[PDB]
């Protein structure tokens, strides 16, 4: 589930 980043943090 939701294993990804779009906006770097």
């Amino acid at each position, epitope marked *: 589930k939701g294993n990804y980043v779009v906006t*770097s943090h």
Partner: antibody, heavy 120, light 108 residues
Framework: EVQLVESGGGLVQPGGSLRLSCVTSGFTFRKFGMSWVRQAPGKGLEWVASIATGGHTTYYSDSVKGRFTISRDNSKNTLYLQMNSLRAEDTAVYYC?????????????WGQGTLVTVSS | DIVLTQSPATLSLSPGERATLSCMTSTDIDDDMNWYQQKPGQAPRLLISEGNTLRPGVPARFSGSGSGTDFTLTISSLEPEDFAVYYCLQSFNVPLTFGQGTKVEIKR
């Protein structure tokens, strides 16, 4: 308004390399995730790679992992795809695309595509 | 990888009829389904994003429903410009995966 313009495609021999570029306009590029999606002739859509706003975090399809590298230059509104060790089955129209939200790579805007043909 | 199964692969209908397009997933993807339209020679267009959200500018006759494993795109009454290919896309996880497409074609 929003424009995504691909370039760098063309004919290449198996084993060869190409580098695609996509230059964007009409939005603050560095605030958006970006992806490449391809479509082989007569076939459906296939996601290739994605990159986060900062340009460090990247994702790849298993078909291209280790051969393709996605990167971006936020000072030039530009997305790249470095394509190495190309194979016939990589032949497709490659589209530059924008993730529609700060948390999703689902694509809203698409370029016109650039054709890549791999053949001996 | 999550598999999206679109059916029917071809939907044969006339202008004015209701179009129902199905997309089923190999695992529960909550509501992270997206629907695209594509015409010949053209780049795809996003119709519906995550949460069955209708995109600004897209006609009201398009609507998405369902969540979990079974998703539907409905075109309430087909216009001539709606005969085209439609793809579903899950954005729940990487790798991002698409269905193989449904062609809405003209019945005669």
């Amino acid at each position: 308004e929003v424009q995504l313009v691909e370039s760098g495609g063309g004919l290449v021999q198996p084993g060869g390399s190409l580098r695609l570029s996509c230059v964007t306009s009409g939005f603050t590029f560095r605030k958006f995730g970006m992806s490449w999606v391809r479509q082989a002739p007569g076939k459906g859509l296939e996601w290739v790679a994605s990159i986060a706003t900062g340009g460090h975090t990247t994702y790849y399809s298993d078909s291209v992992k280790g051969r393709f590298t996605i990167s971006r230059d936020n000072s030039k509104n530009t997305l790249y795809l470095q394509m190495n060790s190309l194979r016939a089955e990589d032949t497709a129209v490659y589209y530059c695309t924008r993730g529609y939200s700060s948390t999703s790579y689902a694509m809203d805007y698409w370029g016109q595509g650039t054709l890549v043909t791999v053949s001996s | 990888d999550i598999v999206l199964t679109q059916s029917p692969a071809t939907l044969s209908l006339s202008p004015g009829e209701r179009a129902t397009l199905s997309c089923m997933t190999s695992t529960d993807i909550d509501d992270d389904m997206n629907w695209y339209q594509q015409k010949p020679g053209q780049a795809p267009r996003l119709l519906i994003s995550e949460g069955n959200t209708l995109r600004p500018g897209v006609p009201a006759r398009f609507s998405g429903s369902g969540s979990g494993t079974d998703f539907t795109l409905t075109i309430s009454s087909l216009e001539p410009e709606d005969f085209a290919v439609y793809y579903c896309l899950q954005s729940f996880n990487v790798p991002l995966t698409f269905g193989q497409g449904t062609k809405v074609e003209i019945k005669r």
